[PDB]
Amino acid sequence: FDAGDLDKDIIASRLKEDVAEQQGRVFRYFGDKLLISEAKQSFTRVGENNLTCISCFQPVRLFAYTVSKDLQLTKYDITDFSKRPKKLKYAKGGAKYIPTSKHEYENTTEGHYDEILTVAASPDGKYVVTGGRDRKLIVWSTESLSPVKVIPTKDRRGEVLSLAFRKNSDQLYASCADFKIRTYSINQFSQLEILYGHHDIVEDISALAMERCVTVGARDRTAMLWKIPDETRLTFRGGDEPQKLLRRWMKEPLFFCEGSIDVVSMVDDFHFITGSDNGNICLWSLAKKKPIFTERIAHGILPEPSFNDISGETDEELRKRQLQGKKLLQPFWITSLYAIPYSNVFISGSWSGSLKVWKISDNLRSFELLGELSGAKGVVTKIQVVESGKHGKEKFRILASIAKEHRLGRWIANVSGARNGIYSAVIDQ
Amino acid sequence: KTYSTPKRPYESSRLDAELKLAGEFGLKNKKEIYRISFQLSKIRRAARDLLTRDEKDPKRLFEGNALIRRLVRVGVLSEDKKKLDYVLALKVEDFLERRLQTQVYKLGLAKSVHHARVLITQRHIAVGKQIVNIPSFMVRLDSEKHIDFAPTSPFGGARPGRVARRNAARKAEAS
Amino acid sequence: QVLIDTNFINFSIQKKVDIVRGMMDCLLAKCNPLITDCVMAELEKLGPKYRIALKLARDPRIKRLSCSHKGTYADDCLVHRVLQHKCYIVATNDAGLKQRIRKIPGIPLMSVGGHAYVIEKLPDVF
Amino acid sequence: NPKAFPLADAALTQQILDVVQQAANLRQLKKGANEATKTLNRGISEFIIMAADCEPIEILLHLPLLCEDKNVPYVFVPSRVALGRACGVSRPVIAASITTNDASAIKTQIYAVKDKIETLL
Amino acid sequence: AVTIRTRKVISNPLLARKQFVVDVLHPNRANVSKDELREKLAEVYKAEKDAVSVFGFRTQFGGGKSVGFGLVYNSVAEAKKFEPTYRLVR
Amino acid sequence: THFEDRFDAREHKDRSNKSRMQAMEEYIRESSDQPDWSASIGADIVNHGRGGIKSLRDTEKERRVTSFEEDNFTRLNITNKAEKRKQKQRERNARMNVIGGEDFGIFSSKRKLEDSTSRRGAKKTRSAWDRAQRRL
Amino acid sequence: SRVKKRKKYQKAQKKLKSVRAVYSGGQSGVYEGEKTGIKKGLTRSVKFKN
Ligand SMILES: [Zn+2]
């Protein structure tokens, strides 16, 4: 019983027009309804190579976008869940869009001239925007597939790494390699506000309906949540020592230190997930700085290279001595991580060739394996979950982009059975 | 007085100290050492008074955890030296490496401390969002990666300054 | 690493300061004081009515380092350990030794006066 | 007995590759075994990062013969790929080098790694 | 052009008005020149400009942004009745 | 006898700021394991330079003004007898004590750390049976 | 004053190359020996007196 706390209610009783401003948690619990054993798995083989991102507009017809290191924004349809995704239009870049000055503030050429990296569709469906190493954020009209506005990043290091829209509102959040986070209105095509703070390049950003975004640096081992208006931020550091793991296990495998945090998806307001290069999928919580649940290597250890290859020496018993057994081994990276919002379910993608989908526990203090989607192989970059149907019984369509390389560079060995194209999979109930 | 003059104003050595510290770090006068040296003498007398005191006395425990953590964030004390025996040993070169003259120069961008001094006072280098034009800025540890040319700066990604824009208009009317 | 005379110990007792705890007040940093072997040979040779200085000289935080000399005379043991390295910081209160070191460049001399100690040729006083 | 000795720890792999990344941006990192060979001849290397998983292990194994001649420290890191992303290079660099440059903002940080390399030797 | 963000949209039906804090973003320009906001804050609503009243604009330091307070009335004749005289003259 | 029966504002007045000692809470922020809402980088620093970066007290008290200005839709200003101290004596407390936005004025204080805690201060286990129940 | 500090130190670093033989660079060229010359009788070495 307090004086001002009554008065705080009275002033806030009159408060109006807060929908996205009000928080929303995990309320949707279809994770036990899903059947992964019998879920159909369809793959397509597109002509372009080194695919980089997929984004899909969903109405309040369904759609699909792909972008590949052939510098080709490509226009697709997925609206029938029983058939493979279909070509509608495209736009290949090239070298005819190389800027004239090559040094000025202006980079106002309409097309991408080198190495797109990321795409995102505007949640009204009216626009779609592409970004890359060409340090140009070009938004595209959907219908005629034409450059509607080109945005120079105005910095020499400002290569775009990820694009993140707000749900149902065209505030566009964009990550850049020069430790910048540019924010954008798309209806007015104007630069909002610039955010600062990572020690490393900013590989991934994701958002929800609220005016908050979560970004990760690569090598810094920090994940930062943001307030856009107040321009304040949080800091989530990992730092699990192997010696705290080993001496924990000495009361009775391998443990890995974390090279990077690469990808991040935001599942609800109070929790999210991050991918690492040492196979860690850390469930994070806003109340804590440490991860609320660390799950070590998801896709497993990276395949060990063959004993004959590494030595180059004819003595066979000498070849195994150079490998140093367990010391040489490495894990799969986590190169894809996306949850359908406010749900108990998220999908991880790598080049183990199994989109390992996880179930969040209902107490939201750990998560747990649902299953695998083994039809894909090779490096997987992005994940977009598209739902349809009624309220309770929902048909889904996971779409993942498969390249023979990573988004950012090669950094890869012994890729096999991997074709460039979209992996489509419908899970029912 | 924000700075105290030393007890020995004119020695053979103290004059050849302040030749070097002003020489290497590009200082303006003798004064900018003593602003640093007086503040350092606050910190160093604080660390000796914590070592008069016993361990498990909370004034050595908490303020010792404060001062070491505080000196990590300004980047003077390295993180590995997380004991009070190291905050005594830091001399006044450790503060001057964190000034914006040297930290621009030692990051690149300059070719010289005196050239890095000129880029600060003409508003070209930027620390995060806000453009900074005072060279004794004392960059923190978290702020170190972010020092870059301003977007409204002709060494950055802006229009050229007046002495190119006058010359570029001059070659058009001449030709 | 600070060398110590006989005389710096004797006026340390009359002015009521610890060596190690009292040097850190003047010096403001950590120090390892170390009496040579010649200097300890003087403190014993001073005799009975200086024996309370000889107790305070042998303290396990006060280090000792040997020397290779044919003599007791530590006023010239000490300068010879200073010219050949110039890392040390001499603590004296001998009048003739101060003049012997103020001609040497770049060696912080240290004497005792009044309450606490004082340093002379340190550029990094504070 | 192994040929890729000394191979670094997992915790030291992090501390090495993070120093590699800042030296990549400060232009003190020279990238490639044929380029790291030259800095040993010029005498300006600080220490040598080598990849253990490159095939073969002997294409770069001339460097410890060249380093221990000149008292330059060296390590092995387990992945050429993870040295790639530390290097800022699209392709895995199997051998890197840190050049001596006195105007180094990472000079207090390099010598933390360099002292943890001579611990292995 | 300019872009406007609205925080704390609070409705006061005693004065029959919509109050909110205005968060004005200046990407490169200099400032926003309040008449231009009374244009733009009108057409985000139905307001027919002079039923809005913006006053409290103190700039973010270094430029780039300005924060203040906006009063959007109903029934434009009420703006002559409840506003002060020094905002009628602006 | 006689009794005052007088209402007191000072007993209901918050005294949190009187015993609040800054180095004690810096241990708290490490041992809290909650995040702490750090601002952006360039959003801190004062006047392109001259004014040292921001105190964490300074981003608190300035936040208290912005939380007050958004409620009352009005601003507060140059009122002189308060400003002549609290802008002179406060911004000189910066240049004397703050270094890189972090305060070193704590460490020259004669305000001792014990007098806040003081073996929990009041409600002290003064008897023997009080000591057994803190073991409980 | 920031120039006279610069033009003093840059002038008082030439003197330092003349009092002692200060380290500089390394050896980046090809050539091995010395340009200025060898003396036989110098012995620029601190002798440990007794
Ligand atoms: Zn001797």
Cα–Cα dist A268/A360, whole Å: 12
Cα–Cα dist A144/A159, whole Å: 27
Task: Inspect the interface and report whether the beta carbons of D44 and G26 lie closer than 8 Å.
Answer: yes
Task: Inspect the interface and report whether the beta carbons of E11 and A193 lie closer than 8 Å.
Answer: no
Cα–Cα dist B144/B159, whole Å: 26
How far apart are the two ends of chain F, measured CA to CA in Å? 42
- Residue pair D75/D50 in contact (Cβ under 8 Å)? The answer is yes
- Residue pair D28/D98 in contact (Cβ under 8 Å)? The answer is yes
Q: Do chains C and A touch (3 or more CB pairs under 8 A)?
A: no
- Residue pair A236/A217 in contact (Cβ under 8 Å)? The answer is no
Q: Do chains A and D touch (3 or more CB pairs under 8 A)?
A: yes
Task: Inspect the interface and report whether the beta carbons of G27 and D43 lie closer than 8 Å.
Answer: yes
Instruction: At A235, list the tokens.
Output: 């800091």
Instruction: At F84, list the tokens.
Output: 């002549």
- Residue pair A300/A352 in contact (Cβ under 8 Å)? The answer is yes
Provide the 3-class DSSP secondary structure of residue F125: coil
Q: Is A265 exposed, middle or buried (0-12, 13-18, 19+ CB in 10 A)?
A: buried
Could you tell me which residues come within 8 angstroms of residue B7 by beta carbon, excluding any fewer than 6 positions away?
A: C125
Cα–Cα dist C116/A145, whole Å: 83
Cα–Cα dist A209/A166, whole Å: 5
What's the gap in Å between the CA of D105 and the closest CA on chain B?
5
Residue spans of alpha helices (H) in D1-121: 10-25, 33-42, 62-67, 80-87, 107-118
Cα–Cα dist A276/A311, whole Å: 30
- Residue pair D62/D37 in contact (Cβ under 8 Å)? The answer is yes
The distance between the two most distant Cα atoms of chain F, rounded to a whole number of Å, is 67
CA-to-CA dists, residue C67 to B57, C76, C79, C101, C109, angstroms: 42, 12, 13, 20, 21
Minimum Cα–Cα distance from B99: chain D residue: D105
Cβ–Cβ contacts within 10 Å for residue D94, how many? 24
Cβ–Cβ contacts within 10 Å for residue A203, how many? 25
Task: Inspect the interface and report whether the beta carbons of A231 and F42 lie closer than 8 Å.
Answer: no
For chain D, which residues make up each domain, given as ranges?
1-121
Cβ–Cβ contacts within 10 Å for residue A397, how many? 22
Task: Inspect the interface and report whether the beta carbons of B106 and D108 lie closer than 8 Å.
Answer: no
What's the gap in Å between the CA of F101 and the closest CA on chain E?
18
Residue spans of alpha helices (H) in chain F: 9-12, 16-19, 22-31, 58-72, 80-86, 88-97, 114-117, 128-135
- Residue pair A195/A253 in contact (Cβ under 8 Å)? The answer is no
Q: Which of F46, F73, F75 is opposite residue E19, by nearest beta carbon?
A: F73
Cα–Cα dist A60/A43, whole Å: 27
Minimum Cα–Cα distance from A20: chain E residue: E7
Number of residues in chain B: 175
Q: Is cis: bond before B58, omega within 30 of 0?
A: no
Cα–Cα dist F9/E78, whole Å: 43
The values of phi and psi at residue B131, to 5°, are -65, 135
Instruction: Show residues of chain D in contact with B105, CB under 8 Å.
Output: 103
Q: Which of F34, F35, F43 is opposite residue A231, by nearest beta carbon?
A: F43
Cα–Cα dist C58/A190, whole Å: 78
Could you tell me which residues come within 8 angstroms of residue B119 by beta carbon, excluding any fewer than 6 positions away?
A: B104, B109, B110, B125, B155
Q: Which helix (H) or strand (E) holds F7?
A: none
Strand-pair category, A356-360 with A367-371: antiparallel
Beta bridge partners of A356: A348
Beta bridge partners of A385: A398
What's the gap in Å between the CA of B140 and the closest CA on chain A?
12
- Residue pair D63/D50 in contact (Cβ under 8 Å)? The answer is yes
- Residue pair A186/A140 in contact (Cβ under 8 Å)? The answer is no
User: Nominal resolution in Å?
Assistant: 3.8
- Residue pair D77/D17 in contact (Cβ under 8 Å)? The answer is yes
Q: Which of B66, B139, B143 is opposite residue F106, by nearest beta carbon?
A: B66
The values of phi and psi at residue F112, to 5°, are -85, 155
Strand-pair category, A64-68 with A72-77: antiparallel
Could you tell me which residues come within 8 angstroms of residue B18 by beta carbon, excluding any fewer than 6 positions away?
A: B30, B33
Could you tell me which residues come within 8 angstroms of residue F121 by beta carbon, excluding any fewer than 6 positions away?
A: none
Structural domain boundaries, residue B146: 9-175
Cβ–Cβ contacts within 10 Å for residue C93, how many? 20
Sign of CA dihedral D55, D57, D59, D60: positive
Strand-pair category, A160-166 with A169-176: antiparallel
What's the gap in Å between the CA of D73 and the closest CA on chain B?
21
**DSSP at B83:** S
Task: Inspect the interface and report whether the beta carbons of B128 and A178 lie closer than 8 Å.
Answer: no
Cα–Cα dist G50/G48, whole Å: 6
- Residue pair A145/A90 in contact (Cβ under 8 Å)? The answer is yes
Within 299-328 of A, beta carbons closer than 8 Å to D belong to: 305, 309-313, 321-322, 324, 327-328
Instruction: Show residues of chain D in contact with A257, CB under 8 Å.
Output: 10-11, 13-14
Cα–Cα dist E53/D102, whole Å: 60
Phi/psi zone of residue A361: left (φ > 0), alpha (ψ -120 to 50 degrees), beta?
beta
Cα–Cα dist B125/B117, whole Å: 10
**What residue type is assigned to position D26 of the chain?**
L
- Residue pair A287/F34 in contact (Cβ under 8 Å)? The answer is yes
Asked if the C-beta of E21 comes within 8 angstroms of chain A's C-beta atoms, the answer is no
- Residue for token pair 């209160």: C93
Provide the 3-class DSSP secondary structure of residue F70: helix
Q: Do chains F and E touch (3 or more CB pairs under 8 A)?
A: yes
- Residue pair A78/A99 in contact (Cβ under 8 Å)? The answer is no
Beta strands of B84-168 (E only): which ranges? 125-127, 130-131, 147-149
- Residue pair C64/C41 in contact (Cβ under 8 Å)? The answer is no
Separation of CA C2 and ligand 1 centre (Å):
15
Show the CA angle centred on residue F99, arms to residues F98 and F103, nearest 5°. 40
Asked if the C-beta of B138 comes within 8 angstroms of chain C's C-beta atoms, the answer is no
Please tell me the total count of domains within chain B. Answer: 1
Provide the 3-class DSSP secondary structure of residue B91: coil
Provide the 3-class DSSP secondary structure of residue B113: helix
What's the gap in Å between the CA of F49 and the closest CA on chain B?
5
Instruction: At A253, list the tokens.
Output: 């495998």
Cα–Cα dist A27/A31, whole Å: 11
Number of residues in chain A: 429
Asked if the C-beta of D27 comes within 8 angstroms of chain G's C-beta atoms, the answer is no
Nearest to A359 by CA among A258, A261, A281, A262: A281
Strand-pair category, E52-54 with E58-59: unpaired
**What residue type is assigned to position F11 of the chain?**
E
Beta strands of chain C (E only): which ranges? 34-36, 63-65, 110-112, 117-119
Cα–Cα dist A348/F84, whole Å: 61
Task: Inspect the interface and report whether the beta carbons of A16 and E1 lie closer than 8 Å.
Answer: no
What's the gap in Å between the CA of C76 and the closest CA on chain G?
10
Provide the 3-class DSSP secondary structure of residue A427: coil
Asked if the C-beta of C118 comes within 8 angstroms of chain G's C-beta atoms, the answer is no
Beta strands of B17-159 (E only): which ranges? 125-127, 130-131, 147-149
Separation of CA C73 and ligand 1 centre (Å):
7
Nearest to A399 by CA among A347, A345, A342: A347
- Residue pair F111/B68 in contact (Cβ under 8 Å)? The answer is no
Nearest to B138 by CA among B20, B32, B14: B32
Gaps in chain E (C to N over 2.5 angstroms) fall after: none
Between the CA atoms of D6, D11, D17 and D19, what dihedral angle is there, to the nearest 10 degrees? -110
Instruction: Show residues of chain G in contact with C83, CB under 8 Å.
Output: 46, 49
Domain E3-90 fold: Alpha-Beta Plaits (3.30.70)
- Residue pair E65/E25 in contact (Cβ under 8 Å)? The answer is yes
- Residue pair B33/B21 in contact (Cβ under 8 Å)? The answer is yes
**DSSP at D34:** H
CA-to-CA dists, residue A12 to A9, B111, E11, angstroms: 5, 58, 10
Strand-pair category, A367-371 with E58-59: unpaired
Task: Inspect the interface and report whether the beta carbons of A196 and B151 lie closer than 8 Å.
Answer: no
Strand-pair category, C63-65 with D29-31: unpaired
Separation of CA C34 and ligand 1 centre (Å):
13
Provide the 3-class DSSP secondary structure of residue F62: helix
CA E48 to chain centre: 13
- Per-residue buried b or exposed e for B84-108, using 16+ beta carbons within 10 Å of the residue's own CB: bebbbebebebbbbbbbbbbbbbbe
- E contact test, residue of F40, F53, F65, F70 with most E CBs within 10 A: F70
For chain E, which residues make up each domain, given as ranges?
3-90
**What residue type is assigned to position D90 of the chain?**
S
Instruction: Show residues of chain B in contact with F53, CB under 8 Å.
Output: 138, 140
- Helix C75-83, helix C37-46: angle, nearest 10: 170
What's the gap in Å between the CA of E34 and the closest CA on chain B?
25
How far apart are the two ends of chain B, measured CA to CA in Å? 60
**DSSP at A302:** P
Separation of CA D24 and ligand 1 centre (Å):
52
- Residue pair A396/A373 in contact (Cβ under 8 Å)? The answer is no
Cα–Cα dist A113/A131, whole Å: 11
Q: Which chains does chain C touch, 3 or more C-beta pairs < 8 A?
A: B, G
Own/partner pairs for B104-110, CB < 8 Å, 24+ apart?
Answer: B104/B147, B105/D103, B106/D103, B106/D104, B106/D105, B107/B144, B107/B147, B107/D26, B107/D105, B108/D26, B108/D27, B109/B147, B109/B149
Cα–Cα dist F75/E59, whole Å: 13
Q: Which of A14, A192, A193 is opposite residue E11, by nearest beta carbon?
A: A14
Task: Inspect the interface and report whether the beta carbons of E61 and F73 lie closer than 8 Å.
Answer: no
Cβ–Cβ contacts within 10 Å for residue F89, how many? 9
Between the CA atoms of C105, C108, C110 and C116, what dihedral angle is there, to the nearest 10 degrees? 140
Could you tell me which residues come within 8 angstroms of residue A226 by beta carbon, excluding any fewer than 6 positions away?
A: A181, A195, A212, A213, A214, A215, A232, A233, A234
- F contact test, residue of E61, E82, E87 with most F CBs within 10 A: E61
**DSSP at A301:** B
Instruction: At A137, list the tokens.
Output: 């954020």
Asked if the C-beta of F73 comes within 8 angstroms of chain A's C-beta atoms, the answer is no
- C contact test, residue of G16, G19, G47, G49 with most C CBs within 10 A: G49
Cα–Cα dist D110/D15, whole Å: 10
Cα–Cα dist C91/E42, whole Å: 81
Task: Inspect the interface and report whether the beta carbons of B62 and F24 lie closer than 8 Å.
Answer: yes
Separation of CA C55 and ligand 1 centre (Å):
20
- Residue pair A351/A332 in contact (Cβ under 8 Å)? The answer is yes
- A contact test, residue of E8, E45, E72 with most A CBs within 10 A: E8
- Residue pair A223/A284 in contact (Cβ under 8 Å)? The answer is yes
Q: Does domain D1-121 have CATH number 3.30.1330.30?
A: yes
Instruction: At B148, list the tokens.
Output: 């870059």
What's the gap in Å between the CA of F74 and the closest CA on chain A?
17
The alpha-carbon radius of gyration of chain B (Å, integer) is 21
**What residue type is assigned to position A400 of the chain?**
A
Q: Is A387 exposed, middle or buried (0-12, 13-18, 19+ CB in 10 A)?
A: middle
Within 35-54 of E, beta carbons closer than 8 Å to B belong to: none
Cα–Cα dist B171/A143, whole Å: 46
Half-sphere exposure of F62 (CA within 13 A, CB side): 11
Separation of CA C54 and ligand 1 centre (Å):
18
CA A322 to chain centre: 37
- Per-residue buried b or exposed e for B49-83, using 16+ beta carbons within 10 Å of the residue's own CB: ebbeeeeeebebbbbbbbbbbbbbebbbbbeebee
Separation of CA A351 and ligand 1 centre (Å):
72
Beta bridge partners of B28: none
Beta bridge partners of A77: A86
Cα–Cα dist A120/A194, whole Å: 19
Cβ–Cβ contacts within 10 Å for residue A20, how many? 15
